[PDB]
Design a protein around this ligand. Structure first.
Ligand code: ZN
Ligand code: ZN
Lengths: 49, 66, 49, 47
């Protein structure tokens, strides 16, 4: 059921869930992990014999 | 990092009221009522208990030995 | 080591945040209830077209 | 006769370290250790 006029509070629960699941610096960690996960393997594989 | 000893503006001793304030908040009271239950009339001395952050706990987590 | 103080502080924090959540919810329901009239000078909102 | 006692990093155990010696804890073996407070007349004014 829709949430009329009781929405200031419900608006910040979603924000809290987001900031709990993903940190403030999550982009840095994700980028570095993706690097260490795929980029290195890609670079070492695509290099010619 | 620790509750001050005196109210900066007023000077009334507030250091000896942190444990009491926590107990009063814990049992049932609310802040606005606990504060005047302790006897903090002037709004200058209330900021001591409302705004104060308790970091000494985090500091004690780093036990030197054992 | 944390039986006293270190645990009581956490207990008071959790109960206080729960009390704040319920306080916010009761404030929201009360704000919804008292919908008789809203005539205030210092507030405004855009209305295009 | 002061052998320059040190405090191990994690053991928090005293050690006797002299010059021209490796810096390690008597047990476990770590590479970090701090010094002990002086014995001087540390006097502050509660001002
Ligand atoms: Zn004051
Ligand atoms: Zn060692």
């Amino acid at each position: 059921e829709i949430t009329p006029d009781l929405w200031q509070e419900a608006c910040w629960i979603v924000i809290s869930s987001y900031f709990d699941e993903k940190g403030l610096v999550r982009q840095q960690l994700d980028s570095f992990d993706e690097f260490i996960q795929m980029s290195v393997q890609r670079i070492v594989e695509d290099a010619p014999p | 990092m620790i509750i001050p000893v005196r109210c900066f503006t007023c000077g009334k001793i507030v250091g000896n009221k942190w444990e009491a304030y926590l107990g009063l908040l814990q049992a049932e009271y609310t802040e606005g009522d606990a504060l005047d239950a302790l006897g903090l009339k002037r709004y200058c001395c209330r900021r001591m208990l409302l705004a104060h952050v308790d970091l000494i706990e985090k500091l004690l987590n780093y036990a030197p030995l054992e | 080591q944390r039986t006293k103080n270190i645990s009581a502080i956490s207990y008071i924090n959790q109960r206080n945040r729960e009390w704040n959540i319920v306080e916010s919810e009761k404030a929201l329901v009360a704000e919804s209830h008292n919908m008789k009239n809203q005539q205030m000078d210092p507030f405004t909102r855009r209305q295009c077209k | 006769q002061q052998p320059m006692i040190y405090i191990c990093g994690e053991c928090h155990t005293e050690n006797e370290i002299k010059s021209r010696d490796p810096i390690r804890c008597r047990e476990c073996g770590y590479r970090i250790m701090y010094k002990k407070r002086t014995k001087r007349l540390v006097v502050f004014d509660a001002r």
